[PDB]
Amino acid sequence: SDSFWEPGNYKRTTKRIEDGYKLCNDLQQLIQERADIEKGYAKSLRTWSKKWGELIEKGPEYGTTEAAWKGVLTESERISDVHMKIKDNLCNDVNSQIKTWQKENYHHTLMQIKERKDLEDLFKKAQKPWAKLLAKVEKAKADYHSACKTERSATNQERNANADSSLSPDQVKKMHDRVQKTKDQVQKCREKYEQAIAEITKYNSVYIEDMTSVFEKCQTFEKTRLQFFKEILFNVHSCLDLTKVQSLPQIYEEFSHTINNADQQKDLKWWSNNHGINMAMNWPS
Amino acid sequence: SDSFWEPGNYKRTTKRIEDGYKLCNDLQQLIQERADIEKGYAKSLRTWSKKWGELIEKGPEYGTTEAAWKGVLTESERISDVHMKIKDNLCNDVNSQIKTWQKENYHHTLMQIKERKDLEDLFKKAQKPWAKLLAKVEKAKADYHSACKTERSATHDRVQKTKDQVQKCREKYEQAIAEITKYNSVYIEDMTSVFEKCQTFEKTRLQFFKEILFNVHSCLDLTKVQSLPQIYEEFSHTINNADQQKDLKWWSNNHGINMAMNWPSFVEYT
Ligand code: NA
Ligand code: NA
Ligand code: NA
């Protein structure tokens, strides 16, 4: 079966050590990826703000109204910083931590992950004795079913010898001898089989102890990985939680301070001063 | 000079009307562009979410730990929806109300903006009488200035009829002047009146842009997105459900020592 207790089957557990390495790679990759998305948004915002900053400048809007329009560009700048800092937090608070743990817990030798290779070895050692007894049981079982088979086809041929009266006495005798010799075989074999089953049945618990002990070494390492991953996940969470960016309220507060300063009278009066009736004229003389 | 009072120069006030209308188009383009960026963030988030959602199921992580990694995917999805609403509010709401105001306060004759032609007309009307007096002043200034020239090289029939000429020029010059000087008050009064119509209208727009900027602000103002504190608790509870004990127990049952075994048993012969 697929049972753990079956020879070689501890390999799902050892494979899981190496899966732990892979999941470090995956998590780093996933975070880096989100980081690029945040870099990308901020980068877009800034491009936008550079573009309109200039179109407003160079275009017809003026005065505090101009300054109000500009408020929006300042907003997006402050927002972009927030997002750069999340990019930077994800990469140097979070990803580096993972990068570090992964370096520290997985070593690479002989085209293997040593933590895997060592433990496969430890299981293999733990399982070797009982593998023998299992092998024995399996020979004994085969060696006894083929003795059963022989004996049934040998007692057959004797059938049709005592009904073939031309055979020589030596021929009739060989067949008689084979039957008796092959039922020595059925017996001898039943015995070795029963003894092999007994021999293994007494090792089982030693086997169980041994494998339990190796398995739990594995569970302990795994426990640790799972704990670590839980923490980094919270650390990720910290990086992304907007409700804790303390500047956010202030960005909007300040953004509407600017809109509020948009003053039509200031703007209009200025316009007259520079372009309309409140300019000097010397009349003709 | 570039003084508004010289003929022609009312025009910068006039260009301003049409610049008004132009700015509405610019404003909508600005907002449209911001909205597109928001939509970009949101689309990105979801692509990322869909990608890793798959790569995680497929990968080795299982259990509640696996459900915690999926926390991020959900938060990401929720953030995308916040920005998608920002796109929509900006577009389907702020931009259309500009579009509406644009069409309520500007109208065209043929290809030209009517409010601008009207007020260019009124300017010219008021400027015209005065411009005519100024045209007079300009002629009689030139007449006099070349009765200067045609009595400087005369210093006997061309000696006293050109002192008669500096009598009739300096006379006329000084009366064109008196005449314009008398119209000034009126011209002042009528340019004043037209310019005020230009200011009243321009004021409408300045007040309207203030309002629209406030709306843009309400649209963009993260501190007022209700759902957002809550997104991040939904997320942390998900992380907090990672239970290594159950994930480990699960493993021991499906892959490790608590699995059942058949121990070797004597099997008989066919
Ligand atoms: Na400008
Ligand atoms: Na999985
Ligand atoms: Na829990």
Numbering used by the authors:
A (entry chain B): 14 to 298
B (entry chain A): 14 to 168, 189 to 303
From the reporting publication:
Each monomer is composed of three long helices, designated α2 (residues 24–71), α3 (residues 76–118 and residues 127–172) and α4 (residues 182–190, 199–207, 213–253 and 261–273) that are flanked on one end by the N-terminal residues 14–23 and on the other by C-terminal residues 274–301, including a short C-terminal helix α5 (residues 277–288). The insert in Drosophila Syndapin (120HHTLMQIK) is structured into a prong that protrudes approximately 18 Å from the concave face of the domain. Residues H121 to T122 and Q125 to I126 form two short β-strands hydrogen bonded into an antiparallel β-sheet scaffold, at the tip of which are positioned two hydrophobic residues, L123 and M124. This prong is surrounded by many basic residues that are also conserved in Syndapin homologues (K127, K130, H120, H121, R129, K28, K137, K35, K112). Yet the radius of curvature of the Syndapin EFC dimer (∼21 nm, assuming prong residues insert into the bilayer) is significantly smaller than CIP4 and FBP17 (both ∼30 nm) or FCHO2 (∼55 nm) making the packing angle of the Syndapin EFC dimer more similar to the radius of curvature of the N-BAR domains of amphiphysin and endophilin (both ∼11 nm) than to other EFC domains.
PACSIN/Syndapins are EFC (extended FCH (Fes/CIP4 homology)) domain proteins implicated in endocytosis because the C-terminal SH3 domain binds physically to the large GTPase dynamin, the phosphoinositide polyphosphatase synaptojanin, or the branched-actin regulator WASp. We have solved the structure of the Drosophila Syndapin EFC domain (alternatively termed F-BAR due to the gross structural similarity of the EFC and BAR domains) that, together with the recent crystal structures of the human PACSIN 1 and -2 F-BAR domains, reveals unique features of this membrane-binding fold.
